[PDB]
Design a protein around this ligand. Structure first.
Ligand code: HEM
Length: 405
């Protein structure tokens, strides 16, 4: 369905891109989105899909809009927008100055010191999962590793029972690549409903887990309230349970298709941190937006107050104006330019945990199962949304070529 074109939007700027089901999804999701950056396509277009909204196609515009919170606000309505409902996550649905006090507390639960503490449990789980798969000579990567690895580490961090995974995983899916069984407002409320009693419990009997830290936290010397804690934890669950999961499948799919890139990392393990960054650029997967606070002309385009604008984080690094041969994976790339973890006051606070999980995966995997391929005849399908992903990734390998550790 295409929403009627608003009177202020010029017809020459129309480009009906569907972020939840892009026209060329079969070429790969990043490729489908990259069609927006072609010379024939304007730097800023309006799509009538999903209620109608702007889409900044170039990294320069995407970066600029994320820096200007005064015009481009994070008090985001959904896409498609829902009547009387909008995002209220903390600190993600807030604009500075208000947003700032909340980042510190969030940073305290998923930040660097926390990642350092998790280090050995992270290494242990990756190794444990990979060793059990190794003798099989085959696996369904998405469900066998991509999902359990990051999710179990997060549940551990959050002090949540692993039995709650199917439920939470279903809900976070609805917040990124919804199948239509729930609205964003219902999915979000269910996440909140799950958290409420948990926050109360830990507020009274605190632990060292992420939920306890938020529940008993302080924002700028003031105690966070139950509701603010609920809204922060809700956001953390989405980030912690969904984002890395999908990214890992893009990376493993690529590696399974490029023996040359596998061998490179095998021979030069010191290049893994660099490979992680490069893969983060090439397989960037998030795309959310902002809302205009007033009538404003941006790069020759008249934007109206209340207009929604999607600023795809995934697009910046794929822009040939930012990186030469952007669709090519080059571990030795000199200046890996991207906005995969965001840009502006809302830079991803879980970026350190993400990188650590990717780097460990790459080392542990290539060290035990160095040679692997995609199952013969398999058609890998990608799904587009606020956080794009891989439907399934059947891999195969000869156990005789594996190294047991
Ligand atoms: C590869 C994985 C990840 C990617 C690519 C990613 C990407 C992003 C992006 C693009 C944003 C900014 C959204 C905006 O500006 O509206 C963001 C925000 C955030 N992410 Fe992630 N993320 C990842 C993993 C995680 C993980 C594991 C967590 C852990 C809980 C997490 C926690 C957060 C938080 C707390 C923020 C909010 C920052 C704020 O609003 O000030 N992310 N992430």
């Amino acid at each position: 369905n295409l929403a009627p074109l608003p009177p202020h939007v010029p017809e020459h700027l129309v480009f009906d891109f569907d972020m939840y089901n892009p026209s060329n999804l079969s070429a790969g999701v990043q490729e489908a989105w990259a069609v927006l950056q072609e010379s024939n396509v304007p730097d800023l277009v309006w799509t009538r899909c999903n209620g109608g909204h702007w889409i900044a196609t170039r990294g320069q515009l995407i970066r600029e809009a994320y820096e200007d919170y005064r015009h481009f606000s994070s008090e985001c309505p959904f896409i498609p927008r829902e009547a009387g409902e909008a995002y209220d996550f903390i600190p993600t649905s807030m604009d500075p100055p208000e947003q700032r006090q909340f980042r510190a507390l969030a940073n305290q639960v998923v930040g660097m010191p926390v990642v350092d503490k998790l280090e050995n449990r992270i290494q242990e789980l990756a190794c444990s999962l990979i060793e059990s798969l190794r003798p099989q000579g085959q696996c369904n990567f998405t469900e066998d590793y991509a999902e359990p690895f990051p999710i179990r580490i997060f549940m551990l961090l959050a002090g949540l029972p692993e039995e709650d995974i199917p439920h939470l995983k279903y809900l976070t899916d609805q917040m990124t690549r919804p199948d239509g069984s729930m609205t964003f407002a219902e999915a979000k409320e269910a996440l909140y409903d799950y958290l409420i009693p948990i926050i109360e419990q830990r507020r009274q009997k605190p632990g060292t887990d992420a939920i306890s830290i938020v529940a008993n936290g302080q924002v700028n010397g003031r105690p966070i309230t139950s509701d603010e804690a609920k809204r922060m934890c809700g956001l953390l669950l989405v980030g912690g349970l969904d984002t890395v999961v999908n990214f890992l499948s893009f990376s493993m799919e690529f590696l399974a298709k490029s023996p040359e890139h596998r061998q490179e990392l095998i021979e030069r393990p010191e290049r893994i941190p660099a490979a992680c960054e490069e893969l983060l650029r090439r397989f960037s997967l998030v795309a959310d937006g902002r809302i205009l606070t007033s009538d404003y002309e941006f790069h020759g385009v008249q934007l109206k107050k209340g207009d929604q604008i999607l600023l795809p984080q995934m697009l910046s690094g794929l822009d040939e104006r930012e990186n030469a041969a952007p669709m090519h994976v080059d571990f030795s790339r000199q200046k890996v330019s991207h906005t995969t973890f965001g840009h502006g006051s809302h830079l991803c606070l879980g970026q350190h945990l993400a990188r650590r999980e990717i780097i460990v995966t790459l080392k542990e995997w290539l060290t035990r199962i160095p040679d692997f391929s995609i199952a013969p005849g398999a058609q890998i399908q990608h799904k587009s949304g606020i956080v794009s992903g891989v439907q399934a990734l059947p891999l195969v390998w000869d156990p005789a070529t594996t190294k047991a550790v």
